[PDB]
Amino acid sequence: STAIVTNVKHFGGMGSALRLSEAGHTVACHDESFKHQDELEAFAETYPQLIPMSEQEPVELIEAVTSALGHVDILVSNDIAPVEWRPIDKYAVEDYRDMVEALQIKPFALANAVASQMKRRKSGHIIFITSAASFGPWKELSTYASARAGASALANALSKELGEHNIPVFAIAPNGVDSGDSPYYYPSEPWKTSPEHVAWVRKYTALQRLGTQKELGELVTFLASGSCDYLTGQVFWLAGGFPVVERWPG
Amino acid sequence: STAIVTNVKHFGGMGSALRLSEAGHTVACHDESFKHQDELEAFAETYPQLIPMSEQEPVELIEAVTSALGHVDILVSNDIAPVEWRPIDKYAVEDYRDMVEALQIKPFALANAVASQMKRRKSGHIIFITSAASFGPWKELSTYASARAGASALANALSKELGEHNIPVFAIAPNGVDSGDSPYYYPSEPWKTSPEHVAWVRKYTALQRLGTQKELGELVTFLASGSCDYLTGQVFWLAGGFPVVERWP
Amino acid sequence: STAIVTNVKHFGGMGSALRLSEAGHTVACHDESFKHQDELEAFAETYPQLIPMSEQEPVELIEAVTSALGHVDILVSNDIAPVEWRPIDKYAVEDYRDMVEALQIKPFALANAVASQMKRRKSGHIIFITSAASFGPWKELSTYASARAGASALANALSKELGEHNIPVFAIAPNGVDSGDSPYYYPSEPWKTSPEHVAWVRKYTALQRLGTQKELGELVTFLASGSCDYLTGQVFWLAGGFPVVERWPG
């Protein structure tokens, strides 16, 4: 069994690849930084069980993994883009195009690249990592929320067509997952260190903590296990019960 | 009150422009065909209460209207694309981009063009006409259903930023609305006349009929009326109770 | 055209009945206090256009209105019950039974009483007033949130069966609607007067105000107009964009 996780250094990347590798999958990894062979090799060294690739675009990635490692059983589309808050009238339209490009066109492209081999084999699992920002409670986050909702809906729609070919499709919509060193999207600092941030988490999440990479990994790996294919089409709101607002005052 | 309805000849376009007009709004209408004087004037003539414009692109359309008529109070982004079923791998990625450009970047670009002027007065209404396909029961409609959910989510997200500024934002997510002569998306032929289509409707919708332009224009006009701004952020599933599924055999 | 609004002195009651009366409906009104003819008559006097009834239970109410005023075209089930926040282990089970009785059994009972005449006539509209507390962001509100979600789901399910008989069914799920003198659920005081409450509203709602009775009335009346029957099965979240949480701090 062979899996690909994109953007492996950020967001859901490491939790997914590490937990998948432990489950006995051969895991190919993608990252922008794997353009430079310095970076690739420093990552191959640190992580001898993972298999990082130079390939950058969806179709050359799928073919490169398919050449080397067999045939893709699992796609984890771990999509990232900078959120910077701003009012609608300030954004340029070309900004929304880039947002949709990173968060929405990308997973479609990866699914579209892998789908016909999975269908031929009548097996595969496809998992988009999106965000709980979809129809979420934020303001001035509009380009981001909407592109993520695009990607979740794409997952749910694909499930309906690929079910016939025995391929479950899932979206994982996180909030408050500790991203460690990565800025996408809850780096240990300021989130574990700054008392103002720590107070925000305890205020608005039900479990009053950040989620761990390992939780995000365990979920990815359960979905990819073949244990619960019948959940196909589910968007999983991995957000520790966010949002939680307080009772009326006084 | 001045309103712009885009793609007025299609989908929800005529219901909206007509029902808005009938309530007192001054309605500027956009359409691809209005690129032609002849097509424009035929419309103007058939519809003397409406004010067809020729402009095609968001910034230019917004400014044309703001000149002619002084300001834009109401945006109805009546967005349309060809609903073509292919398996996901039968598509090219550029087809998804085109669908996203028509259904998602378009209404963003209109919103972004009119926003700062609505924000200045602390008043306005923004309505996106999307589709019930968004998180719906269909297969091989993957590009369409997901682009439509992006638009709907974009409306809901904007309602949250623009509420500060007293600007309600909505989406209307239709299914089965009789669109008369327009192929978007339920032309009266074959949907009122061909027994299978008639049957499909009867099977799968709760009220067992097509929806009407009037029903849709009435909703647009209600949301625009200022009577219930507090509904801001709502996505309206205008789908006659679709989908309905038979009991166990 | 004849309409009934229950619990007319509270929650959505007056906005609905007053706005419906203006639309040309003959409006029968129900209230617990109409048990005492003092109260009935003081209300009939104040509101000569409305038609208050003594009848208390669903079936005697429907028959009493049907006898006097013709035939019920519109039911507005304006359901109320005390919310008092509490942890699960504190509630007695019998409390949850009373909650479900008031918020869930009641609308079913009213629908079940009116449905067979509407179906015979192939016309009628049925509107439950529920709450945005359903799957909402509160904690320790659990009995209330769940009974309201029961009533919204009941509306959506009824729409699917009664559509065949040309009867649209709707739920209106409010939050932050000014209830004036009524404690159900946002009385002018403390909500319009107490600076702490005023600050809470401006914080967590998008429009940064309470909604008016008149807005809640206008919606009821549009749905009941016969203008947009195709919306049948919709739950309307009349909550001015609540909830809105703030950006990450710092």
Add this chain to the structure above:
Amino acid sequence: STAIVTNVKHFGGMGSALRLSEAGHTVACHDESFKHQDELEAFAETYPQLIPMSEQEPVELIEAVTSALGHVDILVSNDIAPVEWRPIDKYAVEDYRDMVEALQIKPFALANAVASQMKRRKSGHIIFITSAASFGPWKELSTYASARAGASALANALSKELGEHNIPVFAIAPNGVDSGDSPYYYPSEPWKTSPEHVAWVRKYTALQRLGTQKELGELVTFLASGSCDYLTGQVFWLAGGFPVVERWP
């Protein structure tokens, strides 16, 4: 870790008890039939890893288990009622009360019985097995679909209060799960053997099969495992992609 599964012979009951056991949990099982020594011991004998109890009522069942086994870490409220289609006016209000009592007051009463002890240790998991009927595509299932949504909403509401206390709460909302010999709700006959039922499944579910007990027990066991507490509040639509609707004819 000690777990209670209610109504173990039905619906999601056997998948849960078996898969939990197989993972190491000590599983106490409840069932209406265990009111009978004979029925109880036949079960015990067939299933030596499980620990059938005789108690019937929430407070008494919770306390029986807490004595026998010291504490309750995991509650799986596997609730069942007869799914009988009548038009809404064909019902009596008391039938709705009974459905609500079985599907909604029951899991509340179990939650409320076990809560204070989970809260004391700051640990536990609560899982309600509800149904995808909740906001679903059916007609004349009005009592059932609405009671199931109440239960699901109750789980989500509790996840928000009990998170402070480190207690994850979930609902699992199934459709089309092969229930073997149980009539709740997809017995292998006629659903694996009768051509129409086989066809109905193939038409309306995405994966075109029934779901399995194993698939459901695996989910219960995963949620109970403590591996992904951060999913708390989730309602799981375990429905093979149901509903799926045909394209236009």
